[PDB]
Design a binder for these strands. Sequence first.
RNA 1: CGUCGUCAGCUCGUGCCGUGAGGUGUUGGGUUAAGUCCCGCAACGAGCGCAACCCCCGCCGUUAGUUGCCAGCGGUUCGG
Length: 231
Amino acid sequence: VKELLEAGVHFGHERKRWNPKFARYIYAERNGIHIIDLQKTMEELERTFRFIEDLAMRGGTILFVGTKKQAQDIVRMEAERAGMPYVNQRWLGGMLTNFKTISQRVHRLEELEALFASPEIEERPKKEQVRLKHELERLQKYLSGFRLLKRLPDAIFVVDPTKEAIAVREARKLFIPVIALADTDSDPDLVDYIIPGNDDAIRSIQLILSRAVDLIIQARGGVVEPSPSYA
RNA sequence: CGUCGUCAGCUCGUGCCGUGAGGUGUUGGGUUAAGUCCCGCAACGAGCGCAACCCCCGCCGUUAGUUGCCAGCGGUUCGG
Ligand SMILES: [Mg+2]
Ligand SMILES: [Mg+2]
Ligand SMILES: [Mg+2]
Ligand SMILES: [Mg+2]
Ligand SMILES: [Mg+2]
Ligand SMILES: [Mg+2]
Ligand SMILES: [Mg+2]
Ligand SMILES: [Mg+2]
Ligand SMILES: [Mg+2]
């Protein structure tokens, strides 16, 4: 799968502001930052991709979570390529532990989708119209990827567990396995299937997520070639 | 029924934090007469209040013209 292409796009990130528990995946400090051991990256990648393939074979769903400014686009296209749920803008506290209450809002979202169509009604007062259109804009902004979730997922794919500790907490509490891309400032104990790679550069996230979703696509009988690559 | 006080408030469901009383939401920034609205946020929503729905005044239109009124017309003891 990977075959040494990792070095061209990334090796690691982050200086002395590190988590010492990450030391099992670090090789050296050269410019002041930590260089991730790429052989350990490959060894972990084999296990992670094997688990991902086994899960995708059985029909389970993976929730792709990423909200940094370097992943608002990669995550969306990668998760949409598999027809898979994603969170892209902001993790709403309780998106998993309060799944029923939060998913009550997508019912309102879909109800407002069938409200603004031309056939039925346009006789609402204009101020109420603007209220409902504000509500629709917010619901679409925050629940556009969450809509594909009909139940609690079988795994969550997180691009930065330190930044997204609330999602990891919710997943670990509910016994849902968590897969994470993590740099040297991360806690690996909370991550079941780790990939020790750089998660702040665009190309590293692109490569990892794109190839992961290629494996998912393969695990359902098909080969879709092109992915959105953005230099 | 008076009063704080027509003051801008008081709470709830589920989730989360805390051994617990409890907290969060409801804090921060801008705005409003207003917990009014916007942005941000472990919260996501909701209820009672605010506002609106009702009445009077201010402009115009349709239906009508008596016991109302009298622009134009003709009478007139001079009051339609
Ligand atoms: Mg918890
Ligand atoms: Mg008071
Ligand atoms: Mg509560
Ligand atoms: Mg406790
Ligand atoms: Mg209060
Ligand atoms: Mg409070
Ligand atoms: Mg008031
Ligand atoms: Mg209010
Ligand atoms: Mg009122």
